[PDB]
């Protein structure tokens, strides 16, 4: 029963949403953000990328410290206080949310807290702390994100059945943990809890973890990870039963045990689904597909031209950077600029150890597309830096169009591997060929020089590896 009139309303304050809102404000538009939770930053900041990366950094340091022992530096076994780790995680998060609130204030962007739902083509109704707020807008930006997949046969109401948020709460270190899903989130959480002392089982229906990534990359990764996790591929969960002494899980498939297994906790990390069906978007005339996605064009417009949608809710890949860039474009289009969201590439990174990172076309995709392509790889066993840094199990891979010589894809498996994507990404966006990359002088000794070296393998000029293109 309180009414507001604004130019732009943004539904959701995640990466996509707040980036869109801030861009609108910087472009001189009157902008209001609606968010059901009490802080900004959405899933990414509060229960996603950031806390997971904090805990993963902790895990990495623990394992490195232990790995120093054979080289003459012996730390004891660490004394660990989970409450303190949790407190630190919360500190990084609170620092960042404080930052976002500060920036919203600085850009004079009003934040309305509560559940927003459309009531008309130009009207969004918010139910929150201050009662009901009716927001009349010229433009709306839908950025309401996604949520974890739940399965009907699983008692998701038992506290020992976790999703990613539960896992990131760090309630305890379960003696035995099952991760359902060999995707990125599952493997990352597995990494975290393994470093803390948990015994890790991973169950995955596909024949490979991180299924979109190439076989050769994932092979290095799997070789590394099979020493610490019990990987059960091409296997599925058929039943989950809560009992007093634990969660009993029945599996069927190639690596399934005969008997149901007892776990102290089960992380259900099957995937995520969009929140498009929860907005009464139809009342604004907006089309929502059967899977809950709100599909948009290259200017991020829904079927209703003055209503935009960005981020996870718009489609895959569900990644923060995609949402940020989409938000920027939507804001710019609303401001009247003729901009489009049409990136050649979108990078993906699994912050496991070693990291698995890739951008552009994978070899799988290249073979299905049927274009003449050639791969070039540099093994980290040949890298001075990787050996000197005790991380020789890695590989840098570039994929080239055979005729044009343009780089069309790249991948790294290795410590700090993700940090190498930038160059590759830039290279693809600029339409670089192998010669461009190879002739650029990369610093030695670094991990990223492998990018250059891979290019050299293609050029046939490589001298840090045997050169089969020699004569």
Ligand X SMILES: Cc1cc2nc3c(=O)[nH]c(=O)nc-3n(C[C@H](O)[C@H](O)[C@H](O)COP(=O)(O)OP(=O)(O)OC[C@H]3O[C@@H](n4cnc5c(N)ncnc54)[C@H](O)[C@@H]3O)c2cc1C
Residue 244: name its binding partner from ligand X, a second copy, Cl ion, none (Cβ under 5 to 8 Å by kind): Cl ion
**Phi/psi class of residue 374: alpha, beta or left (left: φ > 0; alpha: ψ in -120 to 50)?**
beta
Instruction: Confirm or reject binding of residue 145 to ligand X (CB under 6 A).
Output: yes
The structure tokens listed for 326 are 């989409």
Give the whole-angstrom CA distance, residue 147 versus residue 313.
10
The structure tokens listed for 338 are 């003729």
Q: Which of 77, 81, 157, 244 binds Cl ion (CB under 5 A)?
A: 244
Instruction: Confirm or reject binding of residue 418 to ligand X (CB under 6 A).
Output: no
Q: Is 35 annotated as a binding residue?
A: yes
Q: Is 43 annotated as a binding residue?
A: yes
Instruction: Confirm or reject binding of residue 185 to ligand X (CB under 6 A).
Output: yes
User: In terms of Cα–Cα distance, which of 357, 446, 457, 334 is closest to 400?
Assistant: 457
Q: What b/e sequence results for 428-467 when a residue is b if at least 16 CB atoms lie within 10 Å of its CB, and e otherwise?
A: beeebbbeebbeeeeeeebbbbbbbbbbbbbbebbebeee
Q: Which is nearer to a second copy, 108 or 227 (CB)?
A: 108
Give me the least distance between CB of 324 and ligand X, in Å please. 8
Q: Which is nearer to Cl ion, 121 or 205 (CB)?
A: 205
Give the whole-angstrom CA distance, residue 410 versus residue 342.
19
Give the whole-angstrom CA distance, residue 138 versus residue 336.
13
Residue 23: name its binding partner from a second copy, ligand X, Cl ion, none (Cβ under 5 to 8 Å by kind): a second copy
Instruction: Confirm or reject binding of residue 179 to ligand X (CB under 6 A).
Output: no
> If you write DSSP's letter for every residue of 334-353 in order, what string do you get?
HTT-------S---EEE-SS
Q: Which of 9, 10, 49, 265 binds ligand X (CB under 6 A)?
A: 49
Instruction: Confirm or reject binding of residue 181 to ligand X (CB under 6 A).
Output: no
Q: Is 444 a catalytic residue?
A: yes
Give me the least distance between CB of 241 and Cl ion, in Å please. 9
Q: Is 277 exposed, middle or buried (0-12, 13-18, 19+ CB in 10 A)?
A: middle
Q: Which is nearer to ligand X, 121 or 371 (CB)?
A: 121
CA atoms within a 13 Å half-sphere pointing along the CA-CB vector of 393? 12
Give me the least distance between CB of 235 and a second copy, in Å please. 30
Q: Which is nearer to a second copy, 156 or 442 (CB)?
A: 442
* H or E stretch at 44: helix 42-47
Sorted by sequence, the CB contacts under 8 Å of residue 405 that are 6+ apart come out as 433, 434, 435, 458
Interface residues for ligand X in 26-45 (CB under 6 A)?
34-37, 42-44
Residue of 57, 325, 328, 444 with catalytic role: 444
The structure tokens listed for 336 are 């009247």
Give me the least distance between CB of 154 and ligand X, in Å please. 18
Q: Which is nearer to ligand X, 324 or 434 (CB)?
A: 324
Q: Is 205 annotated as a binding residue?
A: no
Give the whole-angstrom CA distance, residue 111 versus residue 25.
13
Q: Is 292 annotated as a binding residue?
A: no
Residue 243: name its binding partner from ligand X, Cl ion, a second copy, none (Cβ under 5 to 8 Å by kind): Cl ion
Q: Are strands 265-268 and 176-180 parallel, antiparallel or unpaired?
A: parallel
Q: Which of 14, 174, 186, 394 binds ligand X (CB under 6 A)?
A: 14
Interface residues for ligand X in 102-121 (CB under 6 A)?
115-116
Give me the least distance between CB of 446 and ligand X, in Å please. 9
Instruction: Confirm or reject binding of residue 236 to Cl ion (CB under 5 A).
Output: yes
3-state secondary structure of 90: helix
> 433 φ, ψ to 5°?
-100, 175
- Contact region for ligand X (CB under 6 A) — 46-54, 200-208, 221-229, 426-434? 46-54
Q: Which is nearer to a second copy, 202 or 428 (CB)?
A: 428
Q: Is 246 annotated as a binding residue?
A: no
User: In terms of Cα–Cα distance, which of 195, 196, 219 is closest to 207?
Assistant: 219
Residue 107: name its binding partner from a second copy, Cl ion, ligand X, none (Cβ under 5 to 8 Å by kind): a second copy
User: In terms of Cα–Cα distance, which of 353, 348, 346 is closest to 416?
Assistant: 353
User: In terms of Cα–Cα distance, which of 428, 322, 417, 410 is closest to 366?
Assistant: 410
Q: Is 24 annotated as a binding residue?
A: no
Binding-site positions read: 16, 35-36, 43-44, 53, 116, 181-188, 204, 271, 312, 318-321, 444
Binding-site positions for NAD(+) read: 181-188, 204, 271
Interface residues with Cl ion (CB under 5 A) are: 236-237, 243-244
Point out the residues that are catalytic. 444
Interface residues with ligand X (CB under 6 A) are: 11-17, 34-37, 42-44, 48-49, 52, 115-116, 143-146, 164, 185, 275, 278-279, 311-312, 318-321, 323, 351, 444
Binding-site positions for FAD read: 16, 35-36, 43-44, 53, 116, 312, 318-321, 444
């Amino acid at each position: 029963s309180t009414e507001i009139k604004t130019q732009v309303v943004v539904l959701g304050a995640g990466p996509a949403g707040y980036s869109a809102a801030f861009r609108c404000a910087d472009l001189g538009l009157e902008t209001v953000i609606v968010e059901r939770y009490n802080t900004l930053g959405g899933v990414c900041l509060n229960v996603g990328c950031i806390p997971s990366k904090a805990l993963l950094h902790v895990a990495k340091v623990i394992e490195e410290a232990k790995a120093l022992a054979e080289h003459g530096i012996v730390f004891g076994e660490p004394k660990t206080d989970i409450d303190k780790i949790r407190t630190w995680k919360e500190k990084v998060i609170n620092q960042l949310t404080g930052g976002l609130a500060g920036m919203a204030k600085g850009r004079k962007v009003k934040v309305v807290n509560g559940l927003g739902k459309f009531t008309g083509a130009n009207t969004l109704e918010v139910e929150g702390e201050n009662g009901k707020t009716v927001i009349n807008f010229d433009n709306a930006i839908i950025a309401a994100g996604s949520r974890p997949i739940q399965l009907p046969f699983i008692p998701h109401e038992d506290p020992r059945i976790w999703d990613s948020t539960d896992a990131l709460e760090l309630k305890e270190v379960p003696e035995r943990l099952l991760v359902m899903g060999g995707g990125i989130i599952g493997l990352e959480m597995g990494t975290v809890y393994h470093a803390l002392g948990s015994q890790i089982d991973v169950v995955e229906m596909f024949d490979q973890v991180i299924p979109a990534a190439d076989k050769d990359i994932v092979k290095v990764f799997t070789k590394r990870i099979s020493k610490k996790f019990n990987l059960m591929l091409e296997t599925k969960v058929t039943a989950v039963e809560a009992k007093e002494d634990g969660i009993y899980v029945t599996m069927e498939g190639k690596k399934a045990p005969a008997e149901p297994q007892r776990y102290d906790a089960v992380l259900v990390a099957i995937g995520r689904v969009p929140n498009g069906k929860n907005l009464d978007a139809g009342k604004a005339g907006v089309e929502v597909d059967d899977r809950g996605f709100i599909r948009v064009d290259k200017q991020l417009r829904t079927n209703v031209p003055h209503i935009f949608a960005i981020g996870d809710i718009v489609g895959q890949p569900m990644l923060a950077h995609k949402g940020v860039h989409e938000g920027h474009v939507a804001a710019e289009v609303i401001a009247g600029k003729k901009h489009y969201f049409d990136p050649k590439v979108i990078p993906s990174i699994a912050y496991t150890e070693p990291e698995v990172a890739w951008v552009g076309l994978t070899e799988k995709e290249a073979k299905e597309k049927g274009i003449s392509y050639e791969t070039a790889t540099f093994p980290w066993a040949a890298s001075g830096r990787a050996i000197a840094s005790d991380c020789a199990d890695g590989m840098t891979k570039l994929i080239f169009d055979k005729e044009s010589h343009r780089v069309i894809g790249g991948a790294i498996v290795g410590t700090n591997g993700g940090e190498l994507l930038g160059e590759i990404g830039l290279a693809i966006e600029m339409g670089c060929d192998a010669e461009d990359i190879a002739l650029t002088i990369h610093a030695h000794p670094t991990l990223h020089e492998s990018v250059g070296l891979a290019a050299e393998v293609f050029e046939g000029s490589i001298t840090d590896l045997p050169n089969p293109k020699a004569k």
